[PDB]
Structure 1
Amino acid sequence: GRLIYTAGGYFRQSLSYLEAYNPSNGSWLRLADLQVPRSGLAGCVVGGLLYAVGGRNNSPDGNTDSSALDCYNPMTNQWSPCASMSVPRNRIGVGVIDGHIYAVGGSHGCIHHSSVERYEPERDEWHLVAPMLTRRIGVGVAVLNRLLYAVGGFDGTNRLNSAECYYPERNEWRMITPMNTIRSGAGVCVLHNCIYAAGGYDGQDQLNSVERYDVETETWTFVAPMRHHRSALGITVHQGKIYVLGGYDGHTFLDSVECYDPDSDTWSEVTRMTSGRSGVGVAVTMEPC
């Protein structure tokens, strides 16, 4: 069976936790800590391995943006460092295409990146690709039909409803239809033929609204809202359902986990994380041993 892995996050300071939730039985396991605390990171999986990408260590003894890529092997319960990115990227988004990891946007101090780079596991090497048309931190990233999408974020001045698509064989970005809502630090994922954007921050409020982009019609449509307003949430897909983990609602660092059933267009509470946190990295792979 497969588990939902949550890595890092923020509560009072950046966190090192790696914990795994099993939808099939409701259990949480605490696994090997990250070597360096980090919030604002992203998670992804390639070849059954879990990767933690970017972020920032907000700590008593200083604040350090991360260029790190680290690899967790469920078979061994060990973290291993990989090649670092060209630049530190806090509040990063990532997507996987054809076994390669794309790192998108994020911040380094007051620098808000439009740059994008691609990691090749078989070479342990990062290479820059074409930059996005827009600087985006707190950017949502998803992959559909071997195309990469960057959705919302913050450009250093404004939070964004805009979104864009990267065509690998052209090494080019093009704008798509903007969302109906400004969202920085939404959760963005794919399910069936649609890109979903859940929650986020519009500069005033954390959001409970959820909308989805149909690549065939090029239009965004709202679906049922989440039960909890949240920005800086983690999101993933497990067996055809969207799960959202944690985040911030302007009052509380949430422990709430919700899942979305697209067939009934309903959100339900599923479990609580062991402690409230925002800015986690989340992905799905095999249980450890």
Structure 2
Amino acid sequence: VGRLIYTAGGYFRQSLSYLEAYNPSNGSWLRLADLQVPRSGLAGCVVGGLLYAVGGRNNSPDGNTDSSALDCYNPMTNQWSPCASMSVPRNRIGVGVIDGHIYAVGGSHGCIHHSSVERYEPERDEWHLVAPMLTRRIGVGVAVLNRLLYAVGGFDGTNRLNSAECYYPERNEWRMITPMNTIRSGAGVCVLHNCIYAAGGYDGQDQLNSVERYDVETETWTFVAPMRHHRSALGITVHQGKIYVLGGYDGHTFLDSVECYDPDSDTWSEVTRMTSGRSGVGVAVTMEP
């Protein structure tokens, strides 16, 4: 009990500093301490009850600064603190956690599209590079299942991608997996039960409402019910056996919609609205502040 869905940063006209937390048990939203630096295209994650904001970019009227930052938010104090910075700026990043360690995957620095990957050790407050992906990927979806790290879709600088790959930590090695049925850049990627879900994204022509899942045992991708809204650059997380998607861009509006997927009924429902429409957020779940 007592866990909230935290959304950090995002974009609407410029990069945002908002930290806001949604309580699925009562429908309430709380506005919490702003990020020290506004950022869109970041990712969020939680280790040891602390919320981490990783990478992104501050797009403002006066600048476009890609972020190498790792910042940690403690719900017990409602305060952000800087942590060690990554080796390189990573906008449009994906992140995953294995065994208490944060993996930062891909992303962009100016016109550079990274294949590099690095791993953070909270105990030592240190990052170290690991093996790079087989593909350069920005707008890459990342998730962890069974202590394996997956990088899904994205954009390599020339093409949006349906390909996906998996990192095996004990071998420090990446291998391709079955590609998705749909090209997806800027999708929401998460894990639920024994599958990696890829929701939404941009296929090079349109923002998508379709959703597909990779069963790690059978190595197949299967479509599930589509979202109500087409969305790219959405936030995503899992809480109490359901997927939550937050915001994004539908080709017309920066959405405030939050939809929730129930795998037992294979249905999506609209559960709340953010306080304002935005894309490019980082999202994670931890205790209320």
TM-score bracket, normalised by the shorter chain, equals: over 0.9
Shift of 1:83: 0.4
SS in 2 for 1:173: strand
Whole-angstrom CA distance in 2 between matches of 1:3 and 1:180 = 33
Whole-angstrom CA distance in 1 between matches of 2:204 and 2:13 = 21
Could you tell me which residue of structure 2 aligns to residue 168 of structure 1? Answer: 169
Shift of 1:80: 0.2
Deviating above 3 A after TM superposition, structure 1's stretches of 4 or more consecutive aligned residues are none
SS in 2 for 1:267: strand
Q: Could you give the per-residue CA deviations for residues 49-96 of structure 1, whole angstroms, max 9, x where no partner exists?
A: 000000000001111000000000000000000000000000000000
Report the count of equivalent residues: 288
Whole-angstrom CA distance in 2 between matches of 1:241 and 1:74 = 23
Q: Could you give the per-residue CA deviations for residues 95-151 of structure 1, whole angstroms, max 9, x where no partner exists?
A: 000100000000000000000000000000000000000000000000000000000
Whole-angstrom CA distance in 1 between matches of 2:40 and 2:73 = 17
SS in 2 for 1:90: coil
Shift of 1:183: 0.1
Q: Could you give the per-residue CA deviations for residues 193-245 of structure 1, whole angstroms, max 9, x where no partner exists?
A: 00000000011100000000000000000000000000000000011100000
Instruction: Tell whether 2:54 aligns with 1:53.
Output: yes
Whole-angstrom CA distance in 1 between matches of 2:58 and 2:279 = 13
SS in 2 for 1:127: strand
Note the 1:1-289 alignment, pairs <5 A.
1-288=2-289
What runs of 5+ residues in structure 1 fail to find an aligned partner? none
Q: Could you give the per-residue CA deviations for residues 252-287 of structure 1, whole angstroms, max 9, x where no partner exists?
A: 000000000000000000000000000000000000
Whole-angstrom CA distance in 1 between matches of 2:274 and 2:55 = 22
RMSD: 0.3
Identity, % of aligned pairs? 100
SS in 2 for 1:169: helix
Whole-angstrom CA distance in 1 between matches of 2:68 and 2:254 = 25
Whole-angstrom CA distance in 1 between matches of 2:225 and 2:176 = 26
Shift of 1:159: 0.2
Shift of 1:155: 0.3
SS in 1 for 2:170: helix
Whole-angstrom CA distance in 1 between matches of 2:48 and 2:248 = 28
What runs of 5+ residues in structure 2 fail to find an aligned partner? none
SS in 2 for 1:102: strand
SS in 1 for 2:259: strand
